[PDB]
Amino acid sequence: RKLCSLDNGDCDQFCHEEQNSVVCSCARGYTLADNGKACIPTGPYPCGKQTLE
Amino acid sequence: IVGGQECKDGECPWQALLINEENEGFCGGTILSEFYILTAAHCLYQAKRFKVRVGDRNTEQEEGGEAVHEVEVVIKHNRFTKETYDFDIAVLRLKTPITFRMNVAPACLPERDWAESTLMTQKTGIVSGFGRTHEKGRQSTRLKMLEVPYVDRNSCKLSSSFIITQNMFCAGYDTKQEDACQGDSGGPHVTRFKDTYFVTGIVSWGEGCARKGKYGIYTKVTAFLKWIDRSMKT
Numbered sequence: 001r002k003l004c005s006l007d008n009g010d011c012d013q014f015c016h017e018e019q020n021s022v023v024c025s026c027a028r029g030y031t032l033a034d035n036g037k038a039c040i041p042t043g044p045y046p047c048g049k050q051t052l053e
Numbered sequence: 054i055v056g057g058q059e060c061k062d063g064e065c066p067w068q069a070l071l072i073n074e075e076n077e078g079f080c081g082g083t084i085l086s087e088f089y090i091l092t093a094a095h096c097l098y099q100a101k102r103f104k105v106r107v108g109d110r111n112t113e114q115e116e117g118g119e120a121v122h123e124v125e126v127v128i129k130h131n132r133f134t135k136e137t138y139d140f141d142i143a144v145l146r147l148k149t150p151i152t153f154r155m156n157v158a159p160a161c162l163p164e165r166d167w168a169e170s171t172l173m174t175q176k177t178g179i180v181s182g183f184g185r186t187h188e189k190g191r192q193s194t195r196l197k198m199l200e201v202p203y204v205d206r207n208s209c210k211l212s213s214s215f216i217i218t219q220n221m222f223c224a225g226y227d228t229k230q231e232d233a234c235q236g237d238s239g240g241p242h243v244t245r246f247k248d249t250y251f252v253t254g255i256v257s258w259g260e261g262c263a264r265k266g267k268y269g270i271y272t273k274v275t276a277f278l279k280w281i282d283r284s285m286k287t
């Protein structure tokens with residue numbers, strides 16, 4: 001397929017085709033990385049992560 | 054949970070347990086944030102008054118990480134119906150904030166469209182809880198988890214003696230003896246995506262437990278995302 005249908009558009013989390021091309025976004029507690037794809041936890045115990053410590 | 058494995062240290066941190074006057078867990082819940090818990094609306098009738106315990110994995114000990122929380126506000130969906138278990142969803146607002154830590158963390162809320170096309174199209178999801186390990190057995194003392202395959206909606210409906218509304222979905226196996234069970238209700242059904250777990254459902258109901266030709270029925274969380282956000286804003 002194409003765009004978001006193609007490996008989630010290379011996004012870590014949310015993917016949506018805006019005006020063609022791809023646009024990635026993140027859940028609450030995360031901030032989109034510089035590459036506009038990865039999602040960086042904005043603090044300890046971000047949502048959806050199993051806890052190690 | 055029938056079958057499946059028990060949640061090891063830190064594997065099911067978003068799991069919440071509702072306890073009665075007797076400190077007995079009757080239902081599960083999912084941590085959405087420091088103040089909110091997601092659960093089944095039908096669970097709100099299985100106890101006249103209850104509290105919320107998080108960070109617990111063995112209900113007959115004290116790992117020291119357990120924490121009891123009192124419910125400040127109970128936000129039930131005004132369209133829930135005991136007759137069909139439709140709109141089986143509710144949000145709990147806690148009096149005091151949850152302190153995230155080992156075994157105590159929230160699951161992420163996805164966006165409707167992305168969730169439906171990417172999370173729910175995945176092979177499996179994961180349900181967990183302190184419910185029975187056998188249809189007739191007693192509540193489990195150790196928290197368990199089970200990987201349950203998403204079930205084709207068609208099969209789902211054809212296999213159900215009860216109406217499967219659009220606020221529901223099937224997960225589980227046709228004949229394999231693994232499924233959620235009584236007590237896991239209101240609990241978490243989360244789907245994994247790149248190591249991040251998203252809330253995709255609420256343990257709702259089933260005809261018995263792990264019965265052949267039957268599946269586990271969950272509340273389709275994606276159908277209540279707006280409602281959930283509204284509930285949390287206030």
Ligand SMILES: CC(C)N1CCC(NS(=O)(=O)CCNC(=O)c2ccc(Cl)s2)CC1
Pocket residue numbers: 135136137138215232233234235236237238256257258259260261262268269270271
């Ligand atoms: C109103 C209709 C839809 N009934 C709801 C309760 C159902 N009984 S039950 O679910 O309480 C039996 C025990 N099983 C469970 O609680 C669950 C099994 C699988 C999941 Cl998912 S919940 C029977 C059908």
Ligand SMILES: [Ca+2]
Pocket residue numbers: 109110111112113114115116117119
């Ligand atoms: Ca304990």
